[PDB]
């Protein structure tokens, strides 16, 4: 049926889901916990499903919950198109500060971002709708951000679209400032958290 | 924030979810497990997220998974409009064969249908998109159906829209035939299953 395959940043995955089309329309399995368990070694669970509507050029991120337990995300653009960027915010990672852009322009493609990574996207179309599943409920005191236009990340956001940032995102610190202030996830700690999820039922 | 309140059929609920609107668009908490736990006494979990696109007049249902563990559903029309009908297929229920129609015409309204109830909807607009969370993964051998146009249910589907049924739904038996063949959930068994979910962690 559908595939799930690792991206260039360890802990980020691309899901391609299958639809069964017929005269009535279509039926799609957008998310399968069984499927994630086979690929990841654990079922991340779904504490919250969030939906955002974004005007064109709106850039949300780079956001992450404090580890642990942080928040894993399964992200899908249900209509319109976004450019999703995953950011390796994890100090000590062999790919720390690296990023990868995935075009999410079809409901049949989903991005999984494990706990401890940074997530962001820009709306490529007016009223782009994004729906994401999170492993952990929202907690304002636990949510953090790095500035998406930080030259230290140097994310290639689309030429020809002016970013529209929230007040919060506009004021966000750069990666270096988050790092020195010890506010970024530690890579070793991320990997240990990953192993811990596999071990809830390794007995 | 958002409300969750019982409908007229015990085990069906209406969720009204809140969005935070701003210049960038909006952010909605479409589903909260914490919220369901407060109302229901248990977190149903999310094994699968399904998405269907339906042409106008398409009627999917009345469907249910064999109890147990059957399948609880959290259903939302993300765009366009459907008329959702919940059916009490549970023999011995004080409201057996009763139904209730909910207009799902806004992404901020969701319907929860606990394990053991029947679910169906008709597309009121062309390409109505429905997204639903299920507590249990899909299993073809476990999925059953009652004919949605059964006069023994007498569901008031919208006047002026011709139903479009799949081959499977077109051929589905009536409620009476499912009943005598012992293929419907038992009400007592439904209630016991409900109590069992509360008790996974009543220790
Ligand atoms: C992330 C999140 C935000 N919110 C609220 C807080 C704000 O009032 C509004 C937007 O928050 P914000 O953090 O700016 O969201 P985004 O990730 O889309 O940039 O939504 C929730 O209610 N729940 C959540 O899980
Ligand atoms: C309910 C369901 C159906 N399917 C498949 C079986 C069929 O080929 C197709 C449509 O099934 P069908 O049972 O007719 O779906 P609906 O509830 O929308 O009437 O989708 C899945 O792959 N997973 C599921 O969870
Ligand atoms: Cl998830
Ligand atoms: Cl559910």
Residue numbers in the entry:
A (entry chain AAA), B (entry chain AAA): -2 to 200
Task: Show sentences the authors wrote.
Streptose forms the central moiety of the antibiotic streptomycin, while DHHS is found in the O-antigen of the zoonotic pathogen C. burnetii. Genome sequencing of S. griseus and C. burnetii has identified StrM and CBU1838 proteins as RmlC orthologs in these respective species. The evidence presented in this and previous studies strongly suggests that both CBU1838 and StrM act as TDP-4-keto-(6-deoxy)-glucose 3’’, 5’’ double epimerases.
TDP binds to both proteins in a similar manner. TDP is held in place by a network of amino acid side chains a (F21∗, R25∗, F28∗, E30∗, Q48, R61, H64, Y140, K170) from both protomers (starred residues from the domain swapped strands). Additional interactions are formed through bound solvent from N50, Q72, Y134, and E145. These are all strongly conserved across RmlC orthologs. Although we were not able to determine a structure with a TDP-linked sugar, the side chains lining the sugar binding (and catalytic) cavity adopt conformations that are highly similar to those in previous structures. As their local hydrogen-bonding networks are also conserved, it is likely that they will also be catalytic in these proteins. A phylogenetic tree suggests that CBU1838 groups with other 3’’,5’’ epimerases, while StrM is closer in sequence to the single site epimerases.
